Structures are given as structure tokens and as C-alpha cells.
């Protein structure tokens, strides 16, 4: 039983990606202090305990599922598509999410507001003519006050429906006060859609749409995500635990039940001695 760890994560042979102050979802959405993570790829995304959010206060229904599938995809490669939003103002921003010196927003999301004094029923489409899945991350804005709702979106209650040939997903934004987070009582709700090859995406919204700017190229592979504060190191190891890399020469380990790579099996025993000699009968 391998019961001790070196305390550091070996950066080979696995493509480790240390996420400094960024969670996977924050790097996905395009949080300003996560701009260095654009188009990154990883075999293991190491997510530090010190990570924090510093943008518009959002919320991900089924957060675990999105984090899991993004981690499994193993890439943040974002392809910008040409979406045509007619009759609305694009590139909305806020002072809660300060990019540069001025107001900003998530870099992978487009905050569409009314243009002039109208907000048409957006109805856009994108076909998936490529042979890979596309991941679209969109949002719904929940304003704090009805005045804000009508000031941003002329409708008194918008809705957002994102649909494909096989599935559809509709959100009715609500207006209500919420706990004060970074100076705002309004929220973003983050939803995702996967467009399989040969399928179509239709976005139909009459208000409260945080539209996508493109798609994340989905992949299949040996990628995952780990929560660990262990520091990365220049060394070779096939088995990574939150406690660092451990040698996989022994068949069992007692370090952590969370593992990645060619790891030993986790057992509850701290020691198991295998006899490699004969009965020991000493003199006298």
C-alpha cells in the first residue's frame, strides 16, 4: 500500500493546467481575470481553492453537469460564429465586471439590450455542418427591478428559447431582488446546448437574452478536472491525486480516493505486508 505522497503534481506525461484564481466555468465564460485561459487545453485541469469570481454575478443551474462535460472535453477552444442580431444593441457591459479601466462583461457572452426604443423578437439560427459537436453557452438575465427590466428590454417579461431538431430549452426570466453580490441584485443564469453534427440551433428570444458569441469545440478524450492546492513540479509521474503525484509501483494506495492516470486502487488499510521470504526462525 502506497501511503505517502511527494506533495507536488508532476507536469509530465500529462498536460496539467494550473488554474490560478480561475474556476473552470469562469475560464469558460470569459471572466476578465481569466483571459489567459482562452483556447487552453489540458489533460488535467487543476482547480485551486483560492479561485474566485470577479464578474457579473451568475448562476449555473446544473453546474456540476456543465463543469463535468467541459472538463471531459479537455479544451477551451472557442470558435466565433457570425450571429446576426438585428435591431438590438450588442456588447452590453456592467461596472461589476471591469475589463480594462471601464465596464465590461464575459468575453464569450454577448449582452443584447434594446436599440433605440424597441426590442424585436430575435430569431436566429446556426447549422452544424461540421463533424464535431458544438457547445453553445448562453444566458438569461434576471433583473432586480421591473423598471430595469423595461429599461433594458422593452417587453415586460421576455423569454428565451434555444432549440435544436431533437431538444428545446425555454427560460422565463423573473424580476426580483436578490442578495447583493459585487454591487448588483440582478443575476445571469447560464445554460448550454450541444448541437450534434448535422443539427441546427435556433435561438428565439423576446428579451433577457445573454447570447453566445460562438461555440466551444467539444472533444472526447482522457481529460478531467481536479480540486487540489498541490503545487506543480517538473517531474515524471503517471498517477496524480489531490495530494500530489504518487508512484504506481505498488498495487494499492491509501493517499486519496480521487485519482487520475495509471493509479493504484484505493484501499482503507494503511499497510499490507506481502511476504517475500520464508518463515523466520532465529537461533536461540
Amino acid at each position, epitope marked *: 500500500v502506497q501511503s505517502s505522497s511527494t506533495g507536488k503534481i508532476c507536469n509530465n506525461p500529462h498536460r496539467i493546467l494550473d488554474g490560478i484564481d480561475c474556476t473552470l466555468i469562469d475560464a469558460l465564460l470569459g471572466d476578465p481575470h481569466c483571459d489567459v485561459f482562452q483556447n487552453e487545453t489540458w489533460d488535467l485541469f487543476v482547480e485551486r*481553492s*483560492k479561485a474566485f469570481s470577479n464578474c457579473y454575478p451568475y448562476d449555473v443551474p446544473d453546474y456540476a453537469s456543465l463543469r463535468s462535460l467541459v472538463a471531459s472535453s479537455g479544451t477551451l477552444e472557442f470558435i466565433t460564429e457570425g450571429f446576426t442580431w438585428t435591431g438590438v444593441t450588442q456588447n452590453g457591459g456592467s461596472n461589476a465586471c471591469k475589463r480594462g479601466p471601464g465596464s465590461g462583461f464575459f468575453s464569450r457572452l454577448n449582452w443584447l439590450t434594446k436599440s433605440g426604443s424597441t426590442y424585436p423578437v430575435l430569431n436566429v439560427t446556426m447549422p452544424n455542418n461540421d463533424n464535431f459537436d458544438k457547445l453553445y453557452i448562453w444566458g438569461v438575465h434576471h433583473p432586480s427591478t421591473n423598471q430595469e427590466q423595461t429599461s433594458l428590454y422593452v417587453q415586460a417579461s421576455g423569454r428565451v428559447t434555444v432549440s435544436t431538431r431533437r431538444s428545446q430549452q425555454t427560460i422565463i426570466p423573473n424580476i426580483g431582488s436578490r442578495p447583493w453580490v459585487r454591487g448588483l441584485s440582478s443575476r445571469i443564469s447560464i445554460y448550454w446546448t450541444i448541437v450534434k453534427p448535422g443539427d441546427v440551433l435556433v435561438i428565439n428570444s423576446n428579451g433577457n437574452l445573454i447570447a453566445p458569441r460562438g461555440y466551444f469545440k467539444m472533444r472526447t478524450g482522457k481529460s478531467s478536472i481536479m480540486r487540489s*492546492d498541490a*503545487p506543480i513540479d517538473t517531474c515524471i509521474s503517471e498517477c496524480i491525486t489531490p495530494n500530489g503525484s504518487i508512484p504506481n509501483d505498488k498495487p494499492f494506495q491509501n493517499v486519496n480516493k480521487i485519482t487520475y492516470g495509471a493509479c493504484p486502487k484505493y484501499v482503507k488499510q494503511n499497510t499490507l505486508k506481502l511476504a517475500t521470504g520464508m518463515r523466520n526462525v532465529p537461533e536461540k
Partner: antibody
Amino acid sequence: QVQLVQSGAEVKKPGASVTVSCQVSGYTLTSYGLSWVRQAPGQGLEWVGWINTYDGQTKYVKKFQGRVTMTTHTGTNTAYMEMKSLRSDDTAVYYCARVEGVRGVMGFHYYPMDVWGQGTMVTVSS
Amino acid sequence: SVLTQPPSVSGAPGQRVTISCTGSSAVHWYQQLPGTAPKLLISGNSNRPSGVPDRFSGSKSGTSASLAITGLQAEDEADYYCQSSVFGGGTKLTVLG
């Protein structure tokens, strides 16, 4: 802005117990571990102990084992260090310093104390 | 582990000061200005944190790390500690006219 704000100066009597507090601001207490470091007046820094916020496991020096207790009140982003059976030699300035690792590793092995509090002058003597 | 350190280097403004530490086993260098909480000056024996001038530097060779301050100003005079848990003895940097 990240800030650690400590209690006021305490004047105690030998044999008593004292409780120093450290209120964190600008970050979440459970994101970082917290070390406690004493400095006798003009005798250099001395590592007292370490609290692992988010799971509560401690590590004190053998010199302080049994007579120092560290806790975290996560509701108020506060950490407390109480020293029981105060001696005269315990007159010192106590600092709470922020250390990085809390998950997978004990932070103070691999990370520095990048943010310090102003320290409280616990004087047990006269 | 035991840390050792060369104490009380008296230097003039504008010069270079070298402070040593010999870890017997991650060393970090802290500065305590007079009447102020200690400050992190370098981590990882080489890395400098945010906010410190580039004149501070660190160098690890084997089991002996050293901290170099170049063109030191008035605010650099303080007491310097190495840390690895255990601290160093301390090294006072005075000003010399």
C-alpha cells in the same frame, strides 16, 4: 483589496487565557489557510500554528501543543486563536497571516504568508 | 530543519546588500519595517510577489539561498527573515552615512 484585521491589544495576568481574533476581508476565509506567528518584543518571528480553514485541521508547534487552540467562525469570516495557561514569556505581538493551500496539501509546506494582519500585543506580565 | 543567517549588515543607501540563509532541508523572505507587520518579499527562493521593486532578487544554489537588494533606498532598511515550520535568526539592515 485583501485585508486582515485583528483584535485590540490584550493585557492579561499569568495563568489566565486569552483569545485573539482575525477578521478577513476581500476574500473568503475558507479559500486560504491561516498561520499564526508570534514575535516577542525584539526577539524575531516565531511560527505558532496553522489552521486549515474549510476542514478545521490544525498544526501547532510542539512547544505550544495542548495550550493553544485555533478555530474559524466561517459565518463572520473570522478566525480565533486562544492561548490557555498564559505565562510571562507569552508577551508578544501575534500576527495572523494568510497561506494558500487548504486542499490536498498543508499549505505552509509549499506556500508563503502573503498577507499579514496588524498583530495584537498580548502582554501577560508587569 | 534549522535556518541560519548572517546578521546586522550595516550599509549605505544606493549599494547592494546580500543576505544568506542555509536551509538544512520552500524558503521565503520577509521584511519587517520598524513598527509594522512583516511583509512577503520573495517566495519560492526566487519569485517576487506583487508590489515589490525589481531590485529585490533571490538565488538558490544547492542548500544555500541568498537575497540581494540593489540600489537600496530608505524604505528598504528593515529586518529580514527567511522562512521554510521555522524562521531565521533575523538580519537588520541599518542605514550608514
